[PDB]
Subunit: 147 residues, 3 copies
C-alpha cells in the first residue's frame, strides 16, 4: 500500500514523521497481515495556508491521509484500519483527532507495482516472496522497522 | 469531500486561492447538499515546469482538480458538478477553461473519515450532525464561509 | 490520463523530467491509442526523506507513479501498460526498477475533464476531435512531442 500523507511545512519534525510512518505502517501490517516492506508512507508537504475547510483557510494543523490499497478487504476490516490510523497518527503526531481526515482508495492487484513488480493477490504474499530471488528479497528486507 | 488542487508556484495569490476554494466549496454544497465544513480544498503547489502535456513541458497556467467523493451520486449530478467546477474555477482563478482538468474519484462512505470520524451515508448528514456533541459541532461550524 | 509522478527534489533534472514525461506519454499512446495531447505527466517533488518504506526513511531514489485513467481497458492491456511504464521510466530516469512503484486508478469518462471539456468514451476520440472547433484543436495540437 501507499499512504500519501498531506501536512503543512515543519508541522512534523523528521522525528515526528518517522513516528507517524511507523504508526501507519504498523497499523496496516497488524490488520492486513501485509509485510512491512510492502507499505509506503509518502509525506507531501505544503505551506500552511494551502488547506481550506468550508472555504475558511486553515493553519498548519491539518492532516489528510489518502491510502491506496489492493481490492479485497471487507468493510469491517477497512473500518477498523481507518479507525486505527486515526488513533495512531493522533498519538504519533500529537495532533487532536478532529484535525484528521482519512480516505481509502482501492485498486485491483494486477495493476499495482511495488519494487518494480506486480503485487500478489491478497493472501498470497507467501508464495510471491518464495519465488523471489535472494537479491530482491535482501533488498526488500532492508525496509523493515520493528520497533 | 477533499479537492486536491494542483497548481504552479505563485500562480494563485493568497486571495486567489481563497476565491477558488470558495468557488469549489460553494459548487459542491449547491449540487450535493453536503455542508460547507465537510468540504476540503487542498492546494498542492509545484514549480512551473513540472507539468507535461503530450510530452511538452508547460508553464505556470495549468490547473488539475482531483476530487475525492462518497459513492452515490448519479452520472447526471456528477457531470453538472464537474461542469460547475470548471466554470467557477475559471472565473475565480482568472484562467481560461482550456487550461482546466478535473477528475472525480469515488469511495464508500464507511471508509472515509473527516474531523476524525466516519462520514454518514449520503443524505444522512442530518442525524449524523444531531448525534454529535456541541464541542464537535462548534468546531466544525468555525469552518464555514458564506460569502 | 493524468500521471502524478512523485520524486525527491533534484533527483530528476529538467532534462530527465522531459525524458520521463516522454517515456510515460509514449507508452500510454502506444498501448491505448489515446492521443499525445490528452496525456498529462505531473511531477510532484518533495525533499528527500519524506518517503518511508516499512517504516525506514528513504533517500532521494524512489519513484511512485500514480496513473488516473478512464474505465474500460482489460486487465491484460493494463498489465502491459504498467510493465511498459516501469521499463521506460527505469531507462529514462536511470533508476533501477526495484525503486519503482506504480498504481492505476480508473474512473468513468463522463466525470473526467481535460482542456475544460468532457473526455469521450474510449475509442471515440475520433468524432470527439472532429466536433471540436479549430481554435480548440490548434490549442491541443501544440501539446505533442513526437521525438
Amino acid at each position: 500500500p501507499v499512504y500519501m500523507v498531506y501536512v503543512s511545512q515543519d508541522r512534523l519534525t523528521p522525528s515526528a514523521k518517522h513516528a507517524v510512518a511507523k504508526a501507519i505502517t504498523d497499523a496496516h501490517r497488524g490488520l492486513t497481515g501485509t509485510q512491512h516492506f510492502l507499505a509506503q508512507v509518502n509525506f507531501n508537504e505544503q505551506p500552511a495556508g494551502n488547506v481550506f475547510l468550508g472555504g475558511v483557510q486553515q493553519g498548519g494543523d491539518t492532516i489528510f491521509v489518502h491510502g491506496l490499497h489492493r481490492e479485497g478487504r471487507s468493510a469491517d476490516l477497512k473500518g477498523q484500519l481507518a479507525q486505527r490510523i486515526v488513533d495512531d497518527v493522533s498519538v504519533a503526531a500529537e495532533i487532536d483527532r478532529k484535525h484528521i481526515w482519512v480516505y481509502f482508495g482501492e485498486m485491483p492487484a494486477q495493476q499495482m507495482v511495488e519494487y518494480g513488480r506486480f503485487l500478489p493477490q491478497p493472501g498470497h504474499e507467501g508464495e510471491w516472496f518464495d519465488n523471489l530471488s535472494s537479491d530482491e528479497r535482501a533488498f526488500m528486507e532492508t525496509n523493515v522497522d520493528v520497533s
